[PDB]
Amino acid sequence: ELSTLEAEMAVERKAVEDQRDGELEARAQKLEADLAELEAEGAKADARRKVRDGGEREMRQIRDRAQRELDRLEDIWSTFTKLAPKQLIVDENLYRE
């Protein structure tokens, strides 16, 4: 059953990655909109730098949350494939998964 299990896992990883890319494109377009809103209205390089740092921090947050979920799936899959008796699973959460 390794083939179909690996297929389902690959589709699930792809789902995580495509969701991340949708979120990041949305937030980057929102940062562009916010920066243009500052540009046309009253704004100096202070407010521009603040909004840019905030948008980039949120984009790091999205990327790193999706990356932690991808690494979660990675350890799930490698653990299942290399599973053997006498192996200890310390994380109760990973065992439930």
Side-chain angles (χ1 to χ4, degrees), residues 1-29 31-97:
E1 296 288 313
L2 223 165
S3 53
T4 111
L5 288 169
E6 165 172 51
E8 300 174 326
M9 183 72 253
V11 169
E12 181 175 359
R13 291 189 63 106
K14 182 181 169 270
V16 180
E17 280 166 345
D18 282 7
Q19 199 284 145
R20 166 207 57 197
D21 289 338
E23 268 197 71
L24 289 164
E25 182 58 30
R27 184 67 193 97
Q29 292 185 21
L31 205 191
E32 186 54 39
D34 294 357
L35 240 60
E37 280 236 3
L38 297 194
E39 274 281 349
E41 289 263 283
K44 273 181 289 181
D46 157 70
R48 310 178 188 189
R49 192 169 65 96
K50 295 294 177 195
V51 170
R52 173 150 292 289
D53 274 305
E56 294 189 7
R57 179 199 331 114
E58 298 189 302
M59 280 191 283
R60 278 185 242 113
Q61 290 169 211
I62 303 176
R63 177 164 266 110
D64 288 319
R65 193 262 327 151
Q67 190 51 46
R68 266 181 286 109
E69 192 178 346
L70 285 170
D71 293 335
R72 178 64 168 191
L73 299 176
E74 190 172 332
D75 268 355
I76 293 162
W77 172 255
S78 51
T79 305
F80 170 70
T81 48
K82 300 175 295 185
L83 213 73
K86 300 179 179 73
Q87 289 195 352
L88 272 93
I89 285 110
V90 180
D91 179 19
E92 185 171 343
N93 204 305
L94 168 59
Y95 181 83
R96 301 307 185 192
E97 207 58 271

